[model samples]
Target: GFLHVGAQLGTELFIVRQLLQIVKQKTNQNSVDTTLKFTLSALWNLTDESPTTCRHFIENQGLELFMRVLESFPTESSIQQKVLGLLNNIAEVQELHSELMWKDFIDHISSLLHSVEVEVSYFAAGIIAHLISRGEQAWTLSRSQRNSLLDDLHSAILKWPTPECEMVAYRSFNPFFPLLGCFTTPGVQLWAVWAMQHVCSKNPSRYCSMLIEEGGLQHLYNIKDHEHTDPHVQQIAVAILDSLEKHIV
Candidate 1:
């Protein structure tokens, strides 16, 4: 806490000064974590004003170096939390460069999804789920892409703190984020229902009546036994139930 009576205000406002000071002594600092916490707190304050500040840090290579320090100090939970905060900033990149975010970063975490370190896997998942899978950007997922990613994500989720684990359930209450674009979220839901209607409506008797083809429906069923597991899943169940109730399936 850089508490100020009056004098510290002059130095505290200069974000550049703190960034430079932290960067110069980061690796050699008494505790890597102390520096990480200080830097992250400062960076977070900078980000509160704008994501461009984060991107600016990345653009100038400071974020890259900062993330590298996080990588080096893998066990440093503080750094991991900070890294997730930084990654969260990246997810909200505006529509113009929205497509520019991620930049092969997905593949970087492909093998690390199940690491024993909770924060590592957590922030990694947060990078994908909260950041990549939220806001206006999520509207871009194609039907097949959504299904494939949903299947992969929904499957991988069973391994960690899904709704199944009590402690993990608090932060990750919704197993639904992956399905948000698929079954919920207004316009996206209309698109999905349109597709479901497309596949089933046209063929009526010719195609299978099951909502999610195979594993998707089963996973939905298993997770929903616990009540309002996810609003999207409930929406999906209602959608299917309504379709069935309306006519003879």
Candidate 2:
């Protein structure tokens, strides 16, 4: 899982160059998606640790390019997952936090929270995790919008059975009737809990209250009390409850 520093420097530059070529080619859509998948995996590794590597991605306008490609292929889960993973790494660069937000990258990834594909949702949650964490760097987001994003994630964690989804369903159902997906899988739950921890940790008083107001606290308590829940996730629930307790009192 560890990338070598010495080789990492030069390899990321090469990977970005390869990414440019692959995304620009339109001859073979099949092979293009395939190669882009592999390239993005390499790009994910590159963007993991180095500012230099991240800079190359930014300088090449990789963020915009990735978004354009993702929007171009709305049905390509392969493209969606890889682009999201790359965006996750880009957001990991703390200084680029505000820049990434300004690009509307957050909304792009946020749209995937309801995706039926676990991989797509998992990667999207990873991007969100990075955003809320790095967003502590004086991000230019409002409290209402911040809470709205948090609420969206909270509804996702609750698997769309909450009031918010009901509100949406009551007005007009767009894919809400058939129900393409739910966040019941352990993997999604794990990441959702992970993201919740950061969200609460950032502004525990406000976020904790927000969670309680929106039924997230009860959900956390339910998970903590559930004997069948995965121990790892249950542990996170405990930590979140502890944070909430401290902030509330």
Candidate 3:
């Protein structure tokens, strides 16, 4: 309700601006970790599904500011999760995707894909999934660099041990559906399927029914049957399908 109200009335930008300022001033100081984490959390909520807030966030140099936050609090998983979570909001906006394409920013995110924290690594993987889902024409980096990053993304995701709880939430499965068909880039498919499997496995009664209702089953079947599908991705697709079937019965 707050997300809808804020976005409807166009007032989130004002709050976002002030929050960004707090993060800029209070970050990098000792004993202020809690303050910065809450500040980042506020920003994260404000930007969720609010493109105006996200645009205002970017215009106020939020991307650059969060980059510093990440650098300043590298070892702080809570801080990293909040910052990456906000970045994930920004990544959801197709118009704002270019803002996140900077070489150094991506390199930092790429490294975080390997973070020992599943929360941290999950958000990092989400951001990468949204970016690469746009395909190579949208990738600003060199071709080889993009390829290597794809390989790294897959490996990092493959190594993750399923957390006992869900790592993140999604407003809709729409974003991941297109990614499931990205046969040329199985890494993108891997992220999409992995995310689906995570949610479906964790809360099958909800996500399993939602996936089938959303027509996600067709996409999963496509992945499962496609000739070019990577073995790992296909395996995950089959796993999700099996879960959905068991739930249906």
Candidate 4:
């Protein structure tokens, strides 16, 4: 009930603006760490699919504030995950991608792509995939800069250990289906498959069935058999297919 209502009324009530202020003000204090997580969670929930709430967050300088929060709590993986998770929501909005494309912002996120925490690195990978999926022309950074980041994005994803916990929950697999066919940008394909493999591995009965029912199985098969698919990406697609096959019996 709380999240459902928050999604509908969060912006109208100025809840997002107020939450951004709370995050900006309290993130610097060690004493408020616990409260800050809940606050970030609230903001995350508010911005989930509501572009208006995301815009309000950006309008309130939320992105700048979040960059500070990320730096302020480097060793705090939980905090880092929440902040990056919210940024992932922001990144999902195509119009908001440019807001995240600043050189310095990308540089910072690039470093986080290798975070020791799988959850942190996963969300960082997510942000990069969404931004760069728009292709070379959409990227404001120099061509080589974008290429190097894409390389780093791929390597970082390849290095992630299988997480022991659920790293994230998706609203749907619809967004990932398109990226699966991004033959030219294997980094985007890698991220989509990696995320699917995570959830489907962790909860096979639900996510595995969901993957097949949603027509995700065919995409996985296509990736597994595609001529130019990255070997690493193909491996994950095969892994997900293997998991689904096990659950079917």
Candidate 5:
């Protein structure tokens, strides 16, 4: 119905459904071309008003089909957008299936984080973030398996270093890092700051202790108690301040 609207005309878009059906019929006769044509046509219909409406008995096989298209033609932007468009339509229903998601969806998307095309990773993060936001799994991510995935995410940020990835770095890691002195959690932040301390102790060239003071740890001098400053950051800052008090050598 979207194709029937005021902005579009002069094409046989209305006949596409019937034509696709015929293509499917012909595809059964051993024609990959016909199958591909059907896929192209289905991709075009992803933006249709009833895009969420399954055709005849196909249900959401259209999505499964689009994924097949992606595997065959990984560089097809049109095909990718079409798949994402269909995802937009099915996302609500898909949210209710987190068990399938945790087992299938999140693993699939995270595996794509290194795609050469940036949108793939960007959208992959979007999809995973949706899982984190919509599902109850995030609240329960403090365990070893979840923390392993979190470590993997941190590794991805390390590998990619995109601005978007770095933005969430503090939220995800600050929970575990600064408390390593008085407490223990295997959070990535502990790893980050631990490396800093190791370097400080080794006295690496050009890695003078003052750099750490200016970067984040020195502000404890006037800890006036801002709501934003967590105990972890303050504790680590205090530790850093104490360390710096003894050694900038």
Candidate 6:
């Protein structure tokens, strides 16, 4: 453990110097995109919940690299996944929460909801949840803003995650409807449900009401009713449905 700590400390300074040079290099025409992706991926794993590393990251303007590269490689899935993964890691620090939004962090993540790549969408959704789903934390947005964020995510889950133009839930053809079946894989469904549950748990009456009106109740209900669904997931689905129902009265 101590060995890792020493490396993390050392890494911060090394990353800082390299970060300075890379930004400078990018100013010229060589375009070190491959090197930048490698460096960012290395730092992404190194900085997870590491306060010293994260502080160093911000102090050295590593956040600038992340946001810069994200815009630079707008259509690059691998770069987006890693850069946002790194941002998500550091943003776990409650104190750094405000820095995330002031830098247009949420908007950027929201944009990735439309990503053609499933993992990209999954990572983006997870990052947004990290930002807003931890109720009563420093990552606070208005109820409307939060709903819109989740709604954007909800829509992404229903349509964009799959390449198929027309999707359905439970083998039923209901394009107007959004359900678990709209999701082709379990990962995005689980992440999306976790996100929705977090928001619903925080504001049971308000958020759940809005979600139910958007057909979230049926989604949760179908999940709960399905015997093959994971027990833990079913439990959350039931809990949210119960919360929505209890508060509706």
Q: What TM-score would you give candidate 4 relative to the actual structure? A: 0.90
How high a TM-score does candidate 5 get? 0.38
- Tens digits of per-residue lDDT, candidate 1, 1-249, equal 666667564454456446845754675553575665787666755654355465565555554555555556666655665655555445435432443344344443433345555444544554455333454445353445434444444444435432222111111212232434433333233223323433344544433344443333454344345353455445544555455445543
Q: For residues 1-249, what per-residue lDDT tens digits would candidate 5 score against the true structure?
A: 675666353243444455445444543553445455556546445433332343421343444444444555556554454444334324323423333244434444556645644434434433343333333443343345444554453344334322222111111222222223322222233233433443444553434344443443433343314344435444544654566665655
Best by lDDT: 3
lDDT tens per residue, model 3, 1-249? 566744755565677888988998986454356677788888988877878888999999998888888887778888889889888888888998888889888988988988988889988988888898888899888778788878887888898898978876766687688889888877888988999999988877667777888899889888888887799999999988988888778
Q: For each candidate, what TM-score against the reference?
A: 0.48, 0.58, 0.91, 0.90, 0.38, 0.57
Worst 10 residues of 3 by lDDT: 4-13
Q: Which RMSD does model 4 reach against the true structure?
A: 3.1
Residue-level error in angstroms, candidate 3, position 83: 1.1
Tens digit of per-residue lDDT, candidate 6, span 35-86: 7667666777666656677777787777765667777767777777777777
- State the number of backbone clashes in model 4: 0
Worst 10 residues of 5 by lDDT: 166-175
Tell me the deviation in Å of residue 161 in model 4: 1.1
Clashing pairs in 1: none
lDDT of 2 at 117: 68
Best by TM-score: 3
Of the two candidates 4 and 6, the one with more favorable TM-score, higher being better, is 4
Model 5 misplacement above 4 A: 1-58, 75-78, 92-105, 136-249
lDDT of prediction 2: 0.61
Point out where model 4 deviates above 4 Å: 1-13, 28-31, 246-249
lDDT of 2 at 136: 34
Pairs of residues clashing in candidate 4: none
